Amino acid sequence: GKIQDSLSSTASALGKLQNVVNQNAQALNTLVKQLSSNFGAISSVLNDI
Amino acid sequence: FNFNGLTGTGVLTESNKKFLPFQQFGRDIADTTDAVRDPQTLEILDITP
Ligand SMILES: *[C@@H]1O[C@H](CO)[C@@H](O)[C@H](O)[C@H]1NC(C)=O
Numbered sequence: 001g002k003i004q005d006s007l008s009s010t011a012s013a014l015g016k017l018q019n020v021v022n023q024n025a026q027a028l029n030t031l032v033k034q035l036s037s038n039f040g041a042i043s044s045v046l047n048d049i
Numbered sequence: 050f051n052f053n054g055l056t057g058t059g060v061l062t063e064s065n066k067k068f069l070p071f072q073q074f075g076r077d078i079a080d081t082t083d084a085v086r087d088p089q090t091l092e093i094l095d096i097t098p
Contacts, residue, residue, distance in 0.1 A: 029078075032079045032080075033079075035080075036080050047055075047056050
């Protein structure tokens with residue numbers, strides 16, 4: 001009973017899994033955000049140039 | 050589709066999201082060209098490849 005109450009109430013104790021997910025998401029975002037970079041060119045769109 | 054500045058390939062569908070009269074082009078958190086305003090008929094279209 002105590003452990004089920006503790007799991008129902010407190011939510012941070014699951015961070016051991018939660019962090020994992022966050023990490024993965026972060027990477028993907030950066031990767032996508034890497035598309036909008038000039039890299040020294042005149043535009044960030046292949047169709048544009 | 051070539052909407053006066055944009056060559057590309059995507060499905061053009063009808064949108065329901067509100068647009069400011071000054072705003073034409075739309076983006077996302079993944080900063081991709083999502084929506085567009087047709088010049089002939091002032092209609093808002095979503096692009097989905
Ligand atoms: C452009 O011309 C066509 C034909 O004359 C007309 O139907 C259309 O309404 C015009 N565009 C605008 C924005 O009025």
